Symmetry: D3
């Protein structure tokens, strides 16, 4: 089951992200039920918006807000909900609703299209702008958010370590 | 696994439906293998028809025909096969092939678009007509069905209780 | 060609809307080129949003913004860009952008194409959620565009909508 | 424009079919408007069915029902509404509806677009399942329409199909 | 879980194939992680090619190359990744990278559209040509393959028996 | 009609490309018929491949192969066949097939439709992977066609691309 997926091959550099929401999909917010490991429908988003990246989490992590570390992962093609992808963290969007969303890109073994993206600054400015705007507005018709800013790979990695250790 | 999903938060008012067939999809009839909990292909439908609603069942229920209680769940967007959705029952299409198909709509927490639908009579007449016609004709090129009529929330709820208790 | 499509069967009650952008599609803003009648890519939207309804225009109309009357049309399923749909107007979303005033009509499929909308006779009959999504979209789809802004001002009834159609049709003559 | 598309390269063996509805699509019945050549939404089908094949017509043909010859064309993948495909006729589904008689031709992609259909020379070569689905669809797609009914009467060969094409082409002159 | 799916109802005649890659899909190569049974992203294919058939494996089999027996399964419609389909083997494409890919078609109970295909020779020549060409070229932009030839149902069945027994 | 679409706003820097085949689509090779302007199905590709980019042409151009200049255009999302996109050329893939010489231009969306490509000024700025996929595709998409072969010869810069456009435009006059 998805419940048995490890946090990564080598934390915080090499991680696995369990995808819950594909990039560019219908506005259905799914979530893996932590008890069953099954894909539950969390809610039908009320805004006409879509996640600009595949969205999911790192298993075996516990942040402050209670859940696992949530990650956005850009890919050439939308991924299947419930699928697991190997990535390396490169940044973190910090916001207040405080919450942190990491940005991880596919591991070199899955694709070479991202090798050049080592840090938050290497991410296409538009994409960063879209992620922010999305997080800043998807819940408008409901819960609110306030994007504070981006942080580097180090801070993204620190969040992973802290949450994994905190999960233990 | 899907095998561990509960019948609902509060039977028969608040239930979880394990989706096997998405609304408006290619004519592939999937079914969750009860032993493995895996999605098996039951058959490739022979008619050029598609389920007008997402189709699935309530876990931990056993009707007479042997299976779990089967449910149709309208949603704004097609759901993923194997996904689980929280709903509240509102009616039942009774037919003879006797079989009963409940109609459940998304729980208020997932969407407010259905709050006004409390009973079978609140369902759009077209949709009810489509569900009937579909059930009445999808197996024409194979097994036959004869739609007898709709029943209220109470009867739909009674079917859930009877099947859950019968499952115990 | 799309350029020859009439404004409607009986304006302003019965109109045709030329679809340029389907509902729930990828963020590509298409626009029918006025001279060729061909579907041009106006731009790739910068926000992660999608039109909540099919969006197009009534041909042979000229609003004061120099363009045809814009119309949003909800349909059970997304339509093909470049297709024409028979509708009857039911409301208008009034707004102000960086250029000035703008209005978007909301029209529903005519009774002969579908009965599902027969009960929607006016702006008030539209699901509140739908109205909310349309407003939120227009209010935010251009947020990532330097120098562009939208201020939704409110909705207006069928009568106001029909008024826009006649004025613009006459104005286009 | 689609209005200028020829009936075919060499009628009735080699024809072009203007596609209006793709195979396995959402239940939206499109129709090319005869005067504009534009794709109009004829209606949103009320049943949970979809055309088992791409459906369109041969341009410049006039059958006695006042419309062009209707043709169903199976293809490996669904075609774009408004596209034209070169086919060769292989059969005709004869039926009677509430208005009277109707016939739908079944044509397959010409050998130059694909070799996959070279072995389908006549109505009997079509997979029985495909023939069954087409009949069932026409027999049931209008079930939720008050006052509409279809009674499939049977299939006919390539020769009968080609006969329909020539008669209607000549008839359209 | 998918890990508990049996090899088939009756080996080597009646088997179950666990689908990992749907036919005609985006070039994402998924694979079921053998430890968790979860769908992992193996890699984003670099060529602009797509599997001409649904691709997966027979569970509880171990070939030489180490994995389970991999199967291509033509269907009227693309199948869901992680879904299981009942088929009967009809041929095997042998190649060297040595590797063997079986071709199985849906079991008669799921569809009758394939009853007439009993052996490798009954498969549409184009499809066989497409499978070969695909296998011969998908890894060009990376690992190489050399299609050697097709073999009959018997050889396909022999491969299943050998791998199942070898898996024990 | 598509036949009336101009070659561009300011050739060879600013051009329009009429899309015939979208990126990452089913293997159906569409082609705009030169006389009708309608989208014809040229053929169903025999290989399990798909165009890595949207593919079309610049109207009003005539290369020595007797056809308009072919252009591949990467876009964030696949475009509708028959739509026109404003681009600026950045390179050309030179190749030789069974008929002789051929060249495919690579153009990117103009700055006004999207800023995402502003940094792509020349063939060298294109992602190497993209260049590799395009070459591999043209080199293999016709492998299952008896008597057809492609030999990619190399890439050339913006200048060479712009040269192709002017020569062909002038040549089409
Ligand atoms: Mg959090
Ligand atoms: Mg039952
Ligand atoms: Mg979308
Ligand atoms: Mg305006
Ligand atoms: Mg469908
Ligand atoms: Mg007729
Ligand atoms: Mg192997
Ligand atoms: Mg594809
Ligand atoms: Mg050329």
């Amino acid at each position: 089951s998805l419940l048995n997926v490890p946090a990564g091959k080598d934390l915080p550099e090499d991680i696995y992200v369990v995808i819950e929401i594909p990039a560019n999909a219908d506005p259905i917010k799914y979530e893996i039920d932590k008890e069953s490991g099954a894909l539950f429908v969390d809610r039908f988003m009320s805004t006409a918006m879509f996640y600009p990246c595949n969205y999911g989490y790192i298993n075996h992590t516990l942040s402050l807000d209670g859940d696992p570390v949530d990650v956005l992962v850009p890919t050439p093609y939308p991924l299947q909900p419930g699928s697991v992808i190997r990535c390396r963290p490169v940044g973190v969007l910090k916001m207040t609703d405080e919450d942190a969303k990491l940005v991880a890109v596919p591991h070199s073994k899955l694709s070479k299209e991202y090798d050049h993206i080592k840090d938050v600054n290497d991410l296409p400015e538009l994409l960063k702008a879209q992620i922010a705007h999305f997080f800043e507005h998807y819940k408008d018709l409901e819960k609110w958010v306030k994007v504070e800013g981006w942080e580097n790979a180090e801070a993204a990695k620190a969040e992973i370590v802290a949450s994994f250790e905190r999960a233990k």
